[PDB]
Amino acid sequence: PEMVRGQVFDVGPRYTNLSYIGEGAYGMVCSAYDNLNKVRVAIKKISPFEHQTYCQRTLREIKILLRFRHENIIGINDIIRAPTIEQMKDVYIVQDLMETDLYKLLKTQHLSNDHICYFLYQILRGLKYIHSANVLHRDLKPSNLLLNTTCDLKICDFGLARVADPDHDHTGFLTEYVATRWYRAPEIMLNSKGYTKSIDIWSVGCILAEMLSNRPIFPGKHYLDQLNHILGILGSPSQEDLNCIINLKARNYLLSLPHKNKVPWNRLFPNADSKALDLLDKMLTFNPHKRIEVEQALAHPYLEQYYDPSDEPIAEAPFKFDMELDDLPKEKLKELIFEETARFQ
Ligand SMILES: COCCN1C(=O)c2cc(-c3nc(Nc4ccnn4C)ncc3C)[nH]c2C[C@H]1C
């Protein structure tokens, strides 16, 4: 029963020589050797059974990754668990090991324009597939963009992923959110639950900007501070953009603010490619309806080098409706997780 950093991993014997990777609220990631395929891999221990929300996240994640099959998206090789619902205390996801993530990379390395262009392509390529399955990742960030030595990119961490529900997007002003702050679309703060594809595009824009200068573009310190950062660069939203925000609290807040001028991208990123900045402008659009879509982003002159519609696959079977796990209790969600994982026993 090998243990890592005070956490015990019941994964043997197939997996040996464990090494720590990352720690999550209700999970932990480590590396290990797989004696049945003769290479080291990534193993994620998930202990979501004490909380209901975690059980929900876990079920959605497993279900999505199981269906998904794409070069730029992390898959599941195996799942380790107790043979009975009773003895199941943890769930272990086995996945391909990647050398590093973009977050770790941006901390220490300057990226060449060639690297930025290629990374962005693979992110959009993966995202095209995700969105084609009517799925929103909802938490894209450098830390869940994994890379290897040959600069291949894989998307991971589908904990907050959900089936898109555009019709049920509307919400009040300042409604709480779970996704990482720095990468939250401005609409989250004003009128959106983040149930539309456009929010993933905002995140990719923030990542592109971060790739450009190695610093987050909108590092807010709290819910509202995030909005101010965005507005401090994007400038005051126009009359047309305000007309799409009908809830009064949000609109009256924006109208209460002093006029702020747009900060020109070329001023923020003086070394950047001008086509890259043109695309960055389209991804980072205040109005979600005017925001560039993933397939449009791929066809952008900045990515002309890798653009190929034929080699940008889409999902064979899209997800129909979001699972009704909101009302489900821990115990029953323990049962569905058990069943979804039966195939690997
Ligand atoms: C605890 O759950 C929280 C969510 N979460 C994961 O799901 C997850 C999966 C990996 C992973 N990481 C590597 N490699 C990697 C990255 C950095 N360093 N090295 C070695 N390879 C393969 C995988 C699948 N990393 C994480 C950390 C966070 C984002």
Side-chain angles (χ1 to χ4, degrees), residues 1 4 6-9 11-22 24-35 37 39-49 51-56 58-68 70-88 90-103 105-106 108-175 177-239 241-248 250-266 268-289 291-319 322 328-329 331-338 340-345:
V4 176
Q7 183 65 260
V8 286
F9 278 41
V11 304
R14 195 176 156 171
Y15 316 103
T16 62
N17 204 343
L18 260 70
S19 210
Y20 172 94
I21 289 179
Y26 55 102
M28 172 161 127
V29 186
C30 306
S31 63
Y33 183 77
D34 170 30
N35 313 270
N37 289 104
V39 296
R40 290 177 64 84
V41 297
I43 310 174
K44 170 158 106 155
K45 183 178 179 180
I46 308 162
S47 322
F49 299 131
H51 295 62
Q52 195 260 359
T53 293
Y54 299 3
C55 294
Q56 277 184 233
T58 299
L59 176 52
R60 272 196 291 261
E61 174 164 31
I62 292 181
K63 288 181 141 204
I64 294 168
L65 295 174
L66 285 183
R67 252 225 230 175
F68 279 8
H70 194 282
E71 302 191 331
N72 303 117
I73 301 166
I74 200 62
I76 292 161
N77 295 355
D78 205 353
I79 299 171
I80 294 169
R81 72 138 162 74
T84 54
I85 294 169
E86 295 85 357
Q87 305 156 294
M88 181 165 76
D90 356 80
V91 60
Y92 298 83
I93 309 298
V94 188
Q95 315 184 272
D96 282 343
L97 173 73
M98 300 290 268
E99 215 137 79
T100 190
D101 61 46
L102 188 66
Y103 174 88
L105 195 67
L106 284 177
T108 83
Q109 308 293 335
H110 161 267
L111 254 51
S112 88
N113 183 51
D114 275 359
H115 283 95
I116 298 177
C117 195
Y118 190 46
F119 287 172
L120 184 54
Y121 175 65
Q122 296 181 83
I123 295 167
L124 294 171
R125 198 179 174 257
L127 197 51
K128 194 204 175 175
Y129 182 92
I130 293 162
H131 283 178
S132 79
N134 206 46
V135 158
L136 316 166
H137 185 275
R138 305 205 314 154
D139 200 17
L140 295 165
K141 46 178 162 34
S143 60
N144 55 38
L145 295 180
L146 324 160
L147 302 131
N148 66 3
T149 189
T150 44
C151 292
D152 297 313
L153 182 141
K154 284 194 193 285
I155 304 183
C156 81
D157 189 32
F158 284 78
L160 295 174
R162 318 184 42 120
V163 165
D165 199 359
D167 302 13
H168 291 111
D169 198 51
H170 51 297
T171 201
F173 182 41
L174 284 167
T175 293
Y177 206 65
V178 175
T180 307
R181 199 186 301 131
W182 294 354
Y183 308 91
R184 280 187 213 150
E187 53 256 33
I188 300 275
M189 287 72 84
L190 318 160
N191 69 345
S192 166
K193 300 195 190 138
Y195 289 170
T196 54
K197 284 173 210 189
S198 66
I199 61 100
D200 281 341
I201 299 306
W202 178 271
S203 295
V204 177
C206 292
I207 293 164
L208 174 57
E210 194 157 334
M211 278 202 283
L212 290 179
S213 63
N214 289 78
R215 274 254 310 122
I217 176 144
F218 305 125
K221 295 180 182 297
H222 43 274
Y223 197 90
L224 177 63
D225 190 39
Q226 190 62 35
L227 190 51
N228 287 345
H229 272 85
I230 297 164
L231 301 183
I233 296 278
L234 257 56
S236 288
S238 78
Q239 180 98 283
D241 286 350
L242 273 159
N243 288 349
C244 296
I245 306 197
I246 59 194
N247 91 63
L248 282 158
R251 143 192 300 267
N252 281 328
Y253 172 70
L254 293 173
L255 285 161
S256 86
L257 299 182
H259 183 33
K260 283 123 124 182
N261 272 319
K262 187 150 165 92
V263 168
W265 299 119
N266 65 57
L268 290 159
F269 315 101
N271 311 314
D273 184 316
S274 64
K275 314 195 106 131
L277 294 188
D278 188 65
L279 177 54
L280 174 64
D281 186 62
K282 298 175 145 66
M283 301 177 120
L284 297 186
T285 296
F286 174 90
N287 190 333
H289 302 96
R291 194 169 302 145
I292 200 173
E293 323 206 310
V294 68
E295 283 152 357
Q296 270 181 291
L298 279 165
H300 194 274
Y302 180 54
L303 301 164
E304 55 211 333
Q305 342 181 359
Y306 312 99
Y307 182 48
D308 192 351
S310 70
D311 199 24
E312 275 129 34
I314 60 162
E316 293 177 350
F319 282 82
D322 222 310
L328 275 66
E331 300 83 59
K332 178 59 163 60
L333 294 176
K334 185 151 186 231
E335 293 176 22
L336 305 154
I337 290 180
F338 191 78
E340 273 296 288
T341 47
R343 287 160 271 183
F344 300 89
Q345 293 284 284

CSV table of all heavy atoms in Angstrom, one decimal, residues 21-24 27-29 42 44 61 74 95-101 104 141 143-144 146 156-157, ligand 1, unseen atoms left out:
chain,number,residue,atom,x,y,z
A,21,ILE,N,2.6,14.6,-8.1
A,21,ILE,CA,2.4,15.6,-9.2
A,21,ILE,C,1.6,16.9,-8.8
A,21,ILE,O,2.1,18.0,-8.9
A,21,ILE,CB,1.7,15.0,-10.4
A,21,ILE,CG1,2.5,14.0,-11.2
A,21,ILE,CG2,1.2,16.1,-11.4
A,21,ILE,CD1,1.9,13.4,-12.3
A,22,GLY,N,0.4,16.7,-8.3
A,22,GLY,CA,-0.4,17.8,-7.9
A,22,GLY,C,-1.4,17.4,-6.8
A,22,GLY,O,-1.8,16.2,-6.7
A,23,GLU,N,-1.9,18.4,-6.1
A,23,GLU,CA,-3.0,18.2,-5.1
A,23,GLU,C,-4.2,19.0,-5.4
A,23,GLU,O,-4.2,20.2,-5.7
A,23,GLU,CB,-2.4,18.6,-3.7
A,24,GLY,N,-5.4,18.3,-5.2
A,24,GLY,CA,-6.7,18.9,-5.5
A,24,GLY,C,-7.6,18.9,-4.3
A,24,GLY,O,-7.3,18.1,-3.4
A,27,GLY,N,-8.9,15.5,-4.5
A,27,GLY,CA,-8.1,14.5,-5.3
A,27,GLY,C,-6.6,14.9,-5.2
A,27,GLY,O,-6.2,15.9,-4.8
A,28,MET,N,-5.8,13.9,-5.7
A,28,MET,CA,-4.4,14.1,-5.8
A,28,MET,C,-3.8,13.3,-7.0
A,28,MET,O,-4.3,12.3,-7.3
A,28,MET,CB,-3.7,13.6,-4.5
A,28,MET,CG,-2.2,13.5,-4.5
A,28,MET,SD,-1.4,13.5,-2.9
A,28,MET,CE,-0.4,12.1,-3.1
A,29,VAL,N,-2.8,13.9,-7.6
A,29,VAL,CA,-2.3,13.3,-8.8
A,29,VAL,C,-0.8,12.9,-8.6
A,29,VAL,O,-0.1,13.7,-8.0
A,29,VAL,CB,-2.4,14.3,-10.0
A,29,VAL,CG1,-1.9,13.6,-11.3
A,29,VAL,CG2,-3.8,14.8,-10.2
A,42,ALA,N,0.2,8.6,-15.1
A,42,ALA,CA,-0.4,9.4,-14.1
A,42,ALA,C,-1.6,8.8,-13.5
A,42,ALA,O,-2.4,8.2,-14.1
A,42,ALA,CB,-0.8,10.8,-14.8
A,44,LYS,N,-4.7,9.5,-10.6
A,44,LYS,CA,-5.4,10.5,-9.8
A,44,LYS,C,-6.3,9.9,-8.8
A,44,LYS,O,-7.3,9.2,-9.2
A,44,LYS,CB,-6.2,11.4,-10.8
A,44,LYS,CG,-7.2,12.4,-10.1
A,44,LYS,CD,-7.5,13.5,-10.9
A,44,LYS,CE,-8.9,13.4,-11.5
A,44,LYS,NZ,-9.5,14.8,-11.8
A,61,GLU,N,-17.0,14.0,-14.9
A,61,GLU,CA,-15.7,13.9,-15.5
A,61,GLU,C,-15.4,12.5,-16.1
A,61,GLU,O,-15.0,12.4,-17.2
A,61,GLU,CB,-14.6,14.2,-14.4
A,61,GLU,CG,-13.2,14.0,-14.9
A,61,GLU,CD,-12.2,14.7,-14.0
A,61,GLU,OE1,-12.5,14.8,-12.8
A,61,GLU,OE2,-11.2,15.1,-14.5
A,74,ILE,N,-6.9,14.5,-22.6
A,74,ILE,CA,-6.5,13.4,-21.8
A,74,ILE,C,-7.5,12.3,-21.7
A,74,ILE,O,-8.7,12.6,-21.6
A,74,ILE,CB,-6.1,13.9,-20.4
A,74,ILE,CG1,-5.2,12.8,-19.7
A,74,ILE,CG2,-7.3,14.2,-19.6
A,74,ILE,CD1,-3.9,12.6,-20.4
A,95,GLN,N,-4.1,7.6,-16.2
A,95,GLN,CA,-4.0,8.4,-17.4
A,95,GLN,C,-2.6,8.5,-17.9
A,95,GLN,O,-1.6,8.3,-17.2
A,95,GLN,CB,-4.6,9.8,-17.2
A,95,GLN,CG,-5.9,9.8,-16.5
A,95,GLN,CD,-6.5,11.2,-16.3
A,95,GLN,OE1,-6.2,11.9,-15.4
A,95,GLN,NE2,-7.3,11.6,-17.3
A,96,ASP,N,-2.4,8.9,-19.2
A,96,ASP,CA,-1.1,9.1,-19.8
A,96,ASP,C,-0.4,10.2,-19.0
A,96,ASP,O,-0.9,11.2,-18.6
A,96,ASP,CB,-1.2,9.6,-21.2
A,96,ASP,CG,-1.6,8.5,-22.2
A,96,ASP,OD1,-1.4,7.3,-21.8
A,96,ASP,OD2,-2.0,8.8,-23.3
A,97,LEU,N,0.9,9.9,-18.8
A,97,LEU,CA,1.7,10.9,-18.0
A,97,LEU,C,2.3,11.9,-19.0
A,97,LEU,O,2.8,11.6,-20.1
A,97,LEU,CB,2.9,10.2,-17.3
A,97,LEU,CG,3.9,11.1,-16.7
A,97,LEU,CD1,3.3,11.8,-15.4
A,97,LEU,CD2,5.2,10.3,-16.3
A,98,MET,N,2.1,13.2,-18.6
A,98,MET,CA,2.7,14.3,-19.4
A,98,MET,C,3.9,14.9,-18.6
A,98,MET,O,3.8,14.9,-17.4
A,98,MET,CB,1.7,15.3,-19.7
A,98,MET,CG,0.5,14.8,-20.6
A,98,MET,SD,1.0,14.4,-22.3
A,98,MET,CE,0.6,15.9,-23.1
A,99,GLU,N,4.9,15.4,-19.3
A,99,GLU,CA,6.1,16.0,-18.7
A,99,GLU,C,5.8,17.2,-17.8
A,99,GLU,O,6.4,17.3,-16.7
A,99,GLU,CB,7.1,16.3,-19.8
A,99,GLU,CG,8.5,16.1,-19.3
A,99,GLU,CD,9.4,15.5,-20.4
A,99,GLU,OE1,9.8,16.2,-21.4
A,99,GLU,OE2,9.6,14.3,-20.4
A,100,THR,N,4.9,18.0,-18.2
A,100,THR,CA,4.7,19.3,-17.5
A,100,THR,C,3.3,19.9,-17.9
A,100,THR,O,2.6,19.3,-18.7
A,100,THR,CB,5.8,20.3,-17.7
A,100,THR,OG1,5.7,21.4,-16.8
A,100,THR,CG2,5.8,20.8,-19.1
A,101,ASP,N,3.0,21.0,-17.3
A,101,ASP,CA,1.9,21.8,-17.7
A,101,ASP,C,2.3,23.2,-18.1
A,101,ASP,O,3.4,23.6,-17.8
A,101,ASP,CB,0.8,21.8,-16.6
A,101,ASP,CG,1.3,22.5,-15.4
A,101,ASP,OD1,1.9,23.6,-15.5
A,101,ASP,OD2,1.1,21.9,-14.3
A,104,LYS,N,3.4,25.6,-15.2
A,104,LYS,CA,4.8,25.4,-14.7
A,104,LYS,C,5.7,26.0,-15.7
A,104,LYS,O,6.7,26.6,-15.4
A,104,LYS,CB,5.1,23.9,-14.6
A,104,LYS,CG,4.5,23.3,-13.3
A,104,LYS,CD,4.4,21.8,-13.5
A,141,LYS,N,-7.3,26.7,-17.9
A,141,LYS,CA,-6.2,27.5,-17.4
A,141,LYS,C,-4.9,26.8,-17.6
A,141,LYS,O,-4.9,25.6,-18.0
A,141,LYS,CB,-6.4,27.7,-15.9
A,141,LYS,CG,-6.9,26.5,-15.1
A,141,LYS,CD,-7.0,26.9,-13.6
A,141,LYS,CE,-7.8,25.8,-12.9
A,141,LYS,NZ,-7.6,24.5,-13.4
A,143,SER,N,-2.7,25.6,-15.8
A,143,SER,CA,-2.5,24.4,-15.0
A,143,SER,C,-3.1,23.1,-15.5
A,143,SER,O,-2.6,22.0,-15.2
A,143,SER,CB,-2.8,24.6,-13.6
A,143,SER,OG,-4.2,24.9,-13.4
A,144,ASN,N,-4.2,23.2,-16.3
A,144,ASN,CA,-4.8,22.0,-16.9
A,144,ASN,C,-4.5,21.9,-18.4
A,144,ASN,O,-5.3,21.2,-19.1
A,144,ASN,CB,-6.3,21.9,-16.5
A,144,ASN,CG,-7.1,23.1,-16.9
A,144,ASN,OD1,-6.8,23.7,-17.9
A,144,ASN,ND2,-8.0,23.4,-16.0
A,146,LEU,N,-1.6,20.3,-20.3
A,146,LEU,CA,-0.4,19.5,-20.2
A,146,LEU,C,0.4,19.4,-21.5
A,146,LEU,O,-0.2,19.4,-22.5
A,146,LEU,CB,-0.7,18.1,-19.6
A,146,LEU,CG,-1.8,18.1,-18.6
A,146,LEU,CD1,-2.4,16.6,-18.5
A,146,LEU,CD2,-1.4,18.6,-17.3
A,156,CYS,N,-7.0,18.6,-19.9
A,156,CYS,CA,-7.3,17.8,-18.7
A,156,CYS,C,-8.2,18.5,-17.8
A,156,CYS,O,-8.7,19.7,-18.1
A,156,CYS,CB,-6.1,17.2,-18.0
A,156,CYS,SG,-5.3,18.3,-16.9
A,157,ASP,N,-8.6,17.9,-16.6
A,157,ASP,CA,-9.4,18.5,-15.6
A,157,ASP,C,-10.8,19.0,-16.0
A,157,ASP,O,-11.1,20.1,-16.1
A,157,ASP,CB,-8.7,19.7,-14.9
A,157,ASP,CG,-9.4,20.2,-13.6
A,157,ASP,OD1,-10.1,19.4,-13.0
A,157,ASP,OD2,-9.3,21.4,-13.3
B,1,LIG,C1,-6.3,16.6,-8.3
B,1,LIG,O1,-7.2,16.8,-9.4
B,1,LIG,C2,-7.1,18.3,-9.7
B,1,LIG,C3,-7.1,18.5,-11.2
B,1,LIG,N1,-5.9,18.2,-11.9
B,1,LIG,C4,-5.8,17.0,-12.6
B,1,LIG,O2,-6.7,16.4,-12.9
B,1,LIG,C5,-4.5,16.7,-13.2
B,1,LIG,C6,-4.0,15.8,-14.2
B,1,LIG,C7,-2.7,15.9,-14.3
B,1,LIG,C8,-1.7,15.3,-15.2
B,1,LIG,N2,-0.4,15.7,-15.0
B,1,LIG,C9,0.6,15.2,-15.7
B,1,LIG,N3,1.8,15.7,-15.6
B,1,LIG,C10,2.2,16.9,-15.0
B,1,LIG,C11,1.6,18.1,-14.9
B,1,LIG,C12,2.5,18.9,-14.1
B,1,LIG,N4,3.6,18.2,-13.8
B,1,LIG,N5,3.4,17.0,-14.3
B,1,LIG,C13,4.4,15.9,-14.1
B,1,LIG,N6,0.4,14.2,-16.5
B,1,LIG,C14,-0.8,13.7,-16.7
B,1,LIG,C15,-1.9,14.2,-16.0
B,1,LIG,C16,-3.3,13.6,-16.3
B,1,LIG,N7,-2.3,17.0,-13.5
B,1,LIG,C17,-3.3,17.4,-12.8
B,1,LIG,C18,-3.4,18.6,-11.9
B,1,LIG,C19,-4.8,19.2,-11.9
B,1,LIG,C20,-5.0,20.3,-13.0
